């Protein structure tokens, strides 16, 4: 049931008049239409203004300027003195009731951002990730083995059985979340980054119920670790002193929520889109499987470029900015479309070819660099690598058998369900 594709094919041309970045219906279209829309913007309207989507649109606040060029997204990322992460990194205004749960370091500027990031950043270094490499592989090995055992007919949903669980288990392990609570945590983060998709929720009170629930989970776990320290990130949070003063319970909960949402709702889509690409372009599977360790570094970078799991991130101007002939005003919202930068014809020879040997590969799936560069980048790369190594070893012919069920989202390039089959 997988539709045939030809590597290197550009999307059909999308007329400039047909693009509505502010409509839910646009984000419901398939990737060819979306990719073609962003190609048209790069060529004919590389900076342009759009209204918020209608999803909770009455409280969204103002519209935004869309940056579609790799170099413009780079400039914005590298100059937070102009393009601020405060007050929010999605288009929607962060209302007071949302700020209760989501006013974390990701919506702060330096120096407070850096002081918060430094509490945990040593647990995400390459050498620390190398320590828990063996744990990461054991968890991936066991999940892939369970897929074979749980599905003797050789068919299953890659997302529920592997792509979701592996990153979930790792970040829960690093936070010190008990094994019995994994499913509950994943349900909550699925809803928090699925608002607007009816398979997740379209009811904002249910969203607020979930946010309440994970916030209360976080504070209860932090309260236990304050009494009895463990060697986990939650204990690092309760123990930290920023200029002699400890974090508030509110600050601890927001930080906890940031880490588990980010760890649960990103890598899984790199894996699902990676499987889809290897299914559509079998020469690339054949190349990688023939020399997994020789090709893994370039293959992992190309999977992130192809998937762009985070579609965009917002910034806010503190001064007037005249960029590429477009005059934007102090206080305007500006959006950084990584999904577009990662197809930029000025930065990639042959952007429409999925090439697991690609080098160089200046992909900005982890953002354009700078102060908020993805804290989990090293971890995510290892998570992707070990999952595909275990699929290669245990079920080398695993392939998608249907087009995926796509998450309805402007922010997250989500695959909800991906049927696969193996011999
Ligand atoms: C392939 C997987 C992932 C992708 C594509 C991705 C993408 C991103 C992007 C685009 C940003 C914003 C960068 C910027 O503003 O310049 C970000 C920030 C962040 N990510 Fe990742 N992410 C991934 C996996 C993870 C994982 C597994 C974690 C584990 C906890 C994580 C934790 C974070 C955190 C904490 C931040 C905020 C950093 C800060 O504000 O200083 N991410 N991520
Ligand atoms: C992908 C990761 C790297 C980052 C995750 C960030 C998470 C923890 C946080 C940071 C800011 C939060 C959003 C917000 O402030 C406003 C709204 C509007 C509301 O109508 C629906 C929910 C939404 C999109 C929030 C969803 C959760 C977000 C993205």
UniProtKB/TrEMBL annotation:
InterPro entries: Cyt_P450, Cyt_P450_B, Cyt_P450_sf. GO terms for biological process: cholesterol catabolic process. Keywords: Heme, Iron, Metal-binding, Monooxygenase, Oxidoreductase. Heme b binds at residues 113, 117, 315, 372, 374. Transmembrane segments: none annotated. CDD domains: CYP142-like (cd11033). One of its GO terms (molecular function) is steroid hydroxylase activity. The keyword Iron applies. Its cofactor is heme. It holds the Pfam family p450. Belongs to the cytochrome P450 family. This is Cytochrome P450 124A1, Cyp124A1. It comes from Mycobacterium marinum (strain ATCC BAA-535 / M). The gene is cyp124A1.
């Amino acid at each position: 049931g997988l539709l045939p594709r030809v590597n290197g094919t550009p999307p059909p041309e999308v007329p400039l008049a047909d693009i509505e970045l502010g409509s839910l219906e646009f984000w419901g279209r398939d990737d060819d239409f979306r990719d073609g829309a962003f190609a048209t913007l790069r060529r004919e309207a590389p900076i342009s203004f759009w209204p918020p989507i209608e999803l909770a649109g009455l409280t969204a606040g103002k519209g935004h300027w869309a940056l579609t060029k790799h170099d413009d997204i780079h400039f914005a990322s590298r100059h937070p003195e102009i393009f601020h992460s405060s007050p929010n990194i999605v288009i929607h205004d962060q209302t007071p009731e949302l700020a209760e749960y989501f006013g974390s370091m990701i919506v702060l500027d330096d120096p407070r951002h850096q002081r918060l990031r430094s509490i945990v950043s040593r647990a995400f270094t390459p050498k620390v990730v190398a320590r828990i490499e063996a744990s990461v592989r054991e968890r991936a090995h066991r999940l892939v083995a369970a897929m074979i055992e749980n599905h003797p007919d050789g068919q299953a949903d890659l997302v529920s059985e592997l792509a979701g669980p592996l990153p979930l288990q790792i970040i829960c392990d690093m936070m010190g979340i008990p094994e019995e609570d994994h499913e509950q945590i994943f349900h909550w983060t699925n809803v928090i980054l699925g608002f607007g998709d009816p398979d997740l929720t379209t009811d904002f009170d249910e969203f607020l119920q979930v946010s309440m629930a994970i916030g209360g989970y976080a504070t209860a776990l932090a309260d236990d670790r304050r009494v009895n320290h463990h060697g986990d990130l939650t204990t690092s949070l309760v123990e930290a002193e920023v200029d002699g003063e400890r974090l508030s319970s509110s600050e601890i909960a927001m930080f906890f929520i940031l880490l588990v949402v980010a760890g649960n709702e990103t890598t899984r889509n790199a894996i699902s889109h990676g499987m889809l690409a290897l299914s559509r372009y079998p020469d690339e599977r054949a190349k990688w499987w023939s020399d997994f360790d020789g090709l893994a570094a370039t293959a992992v970078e190309e999977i992130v470029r192809w998937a762009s799991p985070v579609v965009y991130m917002r910034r806010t101007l503190s001064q007037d900015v005249d960029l590429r002939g477009t005059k934007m005003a102090a206080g305007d919202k500006v959006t950084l479309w990584y999904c577009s930068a990662n197809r930029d014809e000025e930065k990639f020879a042959d952007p429409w070819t999925f090439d697991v040997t690609r080098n160089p590969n200046p992909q900005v799936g982890f953002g354009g660099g700078g102060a908020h560069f993805c804290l989990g980048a090293n971890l995510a790369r290892r998570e992707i690598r070990v999952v595909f190594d275990e699929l290669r070893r245990q079920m080398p012919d695993v392939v998608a058998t249907e087009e995926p069920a796509r998450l309805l989202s402007q922010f997250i390039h989500g695959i909800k369900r991906l049927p696969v089959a193996w011999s």
